[PDB]
Write an enzyme that holds these catalytic residues in place. Structure first.
Site, mmCIF file in Angstrom:
data_model
loop_
_atom_site.group_PDB
_atom_site.id
_atom_site.type_symbol
_atom_site.label_atom_id
_atom_site.label_comp_id
_atom_site.label_asym_id
_atom_site.label_seq_id
_atom_site.Cartn_x
_atom_site.Cartn_y
_atom_site.Cartn_z
ATOM 1 N N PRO A 39 1.086 -1.053 0.147
ATOM 2 C CA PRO A 39 0.085 -0.020 -0.030
ATOM 3 C C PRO A 39 0.953 1.061 0.047
ATOM 4 O O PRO A 39 1.725 1.401 0.826
ATOM 5 C CB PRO A 39 -0.893 -0.079 1.238
ATOM 6 C CG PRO A 39 0.258 -0.856 2.124
ATOM 7 C CD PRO A 39 0.807 -1.890 1.312
ATOM 8 N N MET A 40 0.683 2.198 -0.945
ATOM 9 C CA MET A 40 1.510 3.379 -1.033
ATOM 10 C C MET A 40 0.654 4.638 -1.361
ATOM 11 O O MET A 40 0.178 4.803 -2.571
ATOM 12 C CB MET A 40 2.735 3.225 -2.058
ATOM 13 C CG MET A 40 3.756 1.967 -1.571
ATOM 14 S SD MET A 40 5.167 2.250 -2.518
ATOM 15 C CE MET A 40 4.502 1.077 -3.874
ATOM 16 N N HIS B 111 -4.245 -0.898 8.424
ATOM 17 C CA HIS B 111 -3.154 -0.198 8.550
ATOM 18 C C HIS B 111 -2.974 0.044 9.986
ATOM 19 O O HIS B 111 -3.471 1.322 10.539
ATOM 20 C CB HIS B 111 -2.966 1.101 7.793
ATOM 21 C CG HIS B 111 -1.650 1.757 7.763
ATOM 22 N ND1 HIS B 111 -0.766 1.704 8.926
ATOM 23 C CD2 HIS B 111 -1.057 2.533 7.004
ATOM 24 C CE1 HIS B 111 0.208 2.447 8.584
ATOM 25 N NE2 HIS B 111 0.114 3.100 7.523
ATOM 26 N N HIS C 280 2.964 2.323 11.706
ATOM 27 C CA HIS C 280 3.640 3.408 11.072
ATOM 28 C C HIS C 280 3.297 4.895 11.742
ATOM 29 O O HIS C 280 3.435 5.805 11.315
ATOM 30 C CB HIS C 280 3.346 3.476 9.657
ATOM 31 C CG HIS C 280 3.706 2.312 8.875
ATOM 32 N ND1 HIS C 280 3.429 1.955 7.756
ATOM 33 C CD2 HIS C 280 4.667 1.362 9.335
ATOM 34 C CE1 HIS C 280 3.886 0.881 7.052
ATOM 35 N NE2 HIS C 280 4.765 0.583 8.186
ATOM 36 N N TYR D 40 0.314 5.749 12.932
ATOM 37 C CA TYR D 40 -1.034 6.428 12.542
ATOM 38 C C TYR D 40 -1.985 5.801 13.674
ATOM 39 O O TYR D 40 -1.565 5.190 14.737
ATOM 40 C CB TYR D 40 -1.266 5.779 11.129
ATOM 41 C CG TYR D 40 -0.698 6.383 10.110
ATOM 42 C CD1 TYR D 40 0.375 5.579 9.564
ATOM 43 C CD2 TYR D 40 -0.462 8.044 10.110
ATOM 44 C CE1 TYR D 40 1.261 6.252 8.604
ATOM 45 C CE2 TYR D 40 0.419 8.501 9.363
ATOM 46 C CZ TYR D 40 1.370 7.486 8.424
ATOM 47 O OH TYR D 40 2.126 8.394 7.784
ATOM 48 N N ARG E 102 12.730 -2.766 9.970
ATOM 49 C CA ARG E 102 13.700 -2.141 9.268
ATOM 50 C C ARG E 102 13.428 -0.542 9.455
ATOM 51 O O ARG E 102 12.851 0.039 8.508
ATOM 52 C CB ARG E 102 13.381 -2.506 7.925
ATOM 53 C CG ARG E 102 14.636 -2.196 6.850
ATOM 54 C CD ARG E 102 15.403 -3.666 6.472
ATOM 55 N NE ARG E 102 14.495 -4.352 5.960
ATOM 56 C CZ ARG E 102 14.984 -5.562 5.246
ATOM 57 N NH1 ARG E 102 16.084 -6.104 5.489
ATOM 58 N NH2 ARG E 102 13.951 -6.458 4.906
ATOM 59 N N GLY F 109 12.075 -3.102 2.758
ATOM 60 C CA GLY F 109 13.409 -3.474 2.487
ATOM 61 C C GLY F 109 13.670 -4.591 1.661
ATOM 62 O O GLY F 109 14.881 -4.715 0.856
HETATM 63 C C1 LIG Z 1 5.899 6.725 -1.023
HETATM 64 C C2 LIG Z 1 5.490 5.847 0.003
HETATM 65 C C3 LIG Z 1 4.179 5.706 0.420
HETATM 66 C C4 LIG Z 1 3.716 4.650 1.416
HETATM 67 N N1 LIG Z 1 2.280 4.613 1.735
HETATM 68 C C5 LIG Z 1 1.955 3.792 2.558
HETATM 69 C C6 LIG Z 1 0.434 3.786 2.983
HETATM 70 O O1 LIG Z 1 -0.190 4.534 2.625
HETATM 71 N N2 LIG Z 1 0.035 2.790 3.784
HETATM 72 C C7 LIG Z 1 0.944 1.895 4.378
HETATM 73 O O2 LIG Z 1 0.759 1.032 5.253
HETATM 74 N N3 LIG Z 1 2.187 1.746 4.241
HETATM 75 C C8 LIG Z 1 2.799 2.945 3.358
HETATM 76 N N4 LIG Z 1 4.013 2.704 2.984
HETATM 77 C C9 LIG Z 1 4.878 1.893 3.762
HETATM 78 C C10 LIG Z 1 5.914 1.215 2.649
HETATM 79 O O3 LIG Z 1 4.739 0.454 1.961
HETATM 80 C C11 LIG Z 1 7.040 0.454 2.968
HETATM 81 O O4 LIG Z 1 7.916 1.261 3.961
HETATM 82 C C12 LIG Z 1 7.734 0.219 1.626
HETATM 83 O O5 LIG Z 1 6.579 -0.633 0.807
HETATM 84 C C13 LIG Z 1 8.865 -0.774 1.670
HETATM 85 O O6 LIG Z 1 8.980 -0.591 0.178
HETATM 86 P P1 LIG Z 1 10.725 -1.063 0.135
HETATM 87 O O7 LIG Z 1 11.113 -2.013 1.008
HETATM 88 O O8 LIG Z 1 9.770 -2.179 -0.511
HETATM 89 O O9 LIG Z 1 11.439 -1.233 -1.386
HETATM 90 C C14 LIG Z 1 4.495 3.890 1.961
HETATM 91 C C15 LIG Z 1 5.929 3.946 1.610
HETATM 92 C C16 LIG Z 1 6.370 5.007 0.697
HETATM 93 C C17 LIG Z 1 7.793 4.980 0.058
#
Ligand SMILES: Cc1cc2nc3c(=O)[nH]c(=O)nc-3n(C[C@H](O)[C@H](O)[C@H](O)COP(=O)(O)O)c2cc1C
Length: 365
Positions: free
Chosen positions: A24-25, A179, A182, A184, A277, A300
């Site tokens: 989720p991003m 969620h 983080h 929240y 991480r 990560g």
């Molecule tokens: C731009 C961005 C937006 C994110 N948005 C969310 C979110 O809306 N909800 C959530 O639970 N986590 C969110 N995350 C947590 C990230 O999903 C997690 O830190 C990230 O996927 C790790 O990416 P990496 O290890 O895979 O390459 C977000 C991370 C990034 C970088």
């Protein structure tokens, strides 16, 4: 043990063809809180047959946002526009869950109805020196002092998770995710680092889980277990969401989720846990074993760990974030060990429906 990120998987109702999950991003391309064709293209792009994707965090009520242009789903308008996204995903045979996101104190008057105080478990604000909320104009400012929710005023917030959830399904989502970390809202009730409460929602690890339990049980009743995930990275100190004992905090969460699956019966869609991480991956197994169900890894990861996560049975379905941001066809690229586009932070949170959003190109055919 010869299984990999490409081994099919049965996530309850859903038959996944691989373990590559779109984490989720939040990308802030959902101007004014309503989904659009940009999010439609974005997700459809990253879709694959039997591929599981999780939507960017989505507001469950007004005031639940802490970022600009995040999508909402608590209303009819939001729901209506979500359909196109979901359809664009289903047309391409993917599964998509709408993450249930409430930022709690991690917000600002700018995101609050009437420019009021975002709510939380506590009245303590997220310390300024370390983090700041990002406003729609692009500036970064101090997180304000949040108003702790009144005990009775909690079941209400639950209603928001229930409606939004019921809406998610209404818009066609295959389900929703919780969620719960983080820093929240839900996490602000989970983490002893944040939860400076003393009433029925704080103190004991059990009580610290009460809000999450009410939300999960609340949404489950509304839409069914296997249509719900509940991300919880209790070892992530994001937004000052630390905890004296992450491992034991997560076991309580797991326990609560196992208790729920016993009575409710059916298993939740999954448990999603971002890595906390030498030592940077020896603590996920505990939950990845304490929990009776599919365990999603996040944080990560790269193909390397993804495979080992699956292969060496370290963990089931794995979600990917930044790499998926940069690789619409992350699954393919991974499946063939091909090139990977580099991601660019500058456009992680910008509003261009294109640049930094749908630009990362698929591999040259
Ligand atoms: C731009 C961005 C937006 C994110 N948005 C969310 C979110 O809306 N909800 C959530 O639970 N986590 C969110 N995350 C947590 C990230 O999903 C997690 O830190 C990230 O996927 C790790 O990416 P990496 O290890 O895979 O390459 C977000 C991370 C990034 C970088």
């Amino acid at each position: 043990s010869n299984e990999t990120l490409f081994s099919s998987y049965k996530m309850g109702r859903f038959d996944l063809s691989h373990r590559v999950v779109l984490a989720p991003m939040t990308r802030c391309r959902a101007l004014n809180g309503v989904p659009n064709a940009a999010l439609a293209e974005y997700y459809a792009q990253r879709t694959t047959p039997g591929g599981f994707l999780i939507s960017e965090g989505t507001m469950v009520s007004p005031g639940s946002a802490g970022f600009p242009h995040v999508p909402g789903i608590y209303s009819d308008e939001q729901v209506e526009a979500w359909k196109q996204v979901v359809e664009a995903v289903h047309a391409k045979g993917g599964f998509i869950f709408c993450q249930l996101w409430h930022v709690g104190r991690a917000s600002h008057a700018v995101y609050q109805p009437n420019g009021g105080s975002p709510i939380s478990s506590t009245n303590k604000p997220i310390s300024e020196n370390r983090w700041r909320v990002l406003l729609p104009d692009g500036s970064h400012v101090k997180y304000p002092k949040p108003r702790a929710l009144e005990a009775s005023e909690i079941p209400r917030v639950v209603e928001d998770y229930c409606l939004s959830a019921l809406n998610a399904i209404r818009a066609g989502f295959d389900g929703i995710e919780i969620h719960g970390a983080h820093g929240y809202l839900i996490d602000q009730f989970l983490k002893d680092g944040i939860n400076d409460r003393t009433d029925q929602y704080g103190g004991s690890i059990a009580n610290r889980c009460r809000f999450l339990k009410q939300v999960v049980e609340g949404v489950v009743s509304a839409i069914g277990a296997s249509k719900v995930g509940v991300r919880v990275s209790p070892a992530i100190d994001h937004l000052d969401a630390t905890d004296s004992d992450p491992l034991s905090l997560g076991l309580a969460v797991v326990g609560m989720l196992n208790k729920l699956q016993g009575v409710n019966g059916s298993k939740l869609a999954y448990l999603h846990v971002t890595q906390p991480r030498e030592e940077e991956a020896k603590l996920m197994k505990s939950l990845r074993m304490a929990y009776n169900g599919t365990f999603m890894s996040s944080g990560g990861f790269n193909k390397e760990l993804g495979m080992q996560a699956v292969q060496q049975g370290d963990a089931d379905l794995v979600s990917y974030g930044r790499l998926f941001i940069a690789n619409p066809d992350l699954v393919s690229r991974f499946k063939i060990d091909g090139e990977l586009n580099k991601y660019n932070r500058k456009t992680f949170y910008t509003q261009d429906p294109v640049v930094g959003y749908t630009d990362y190109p698929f591999l040259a055919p």
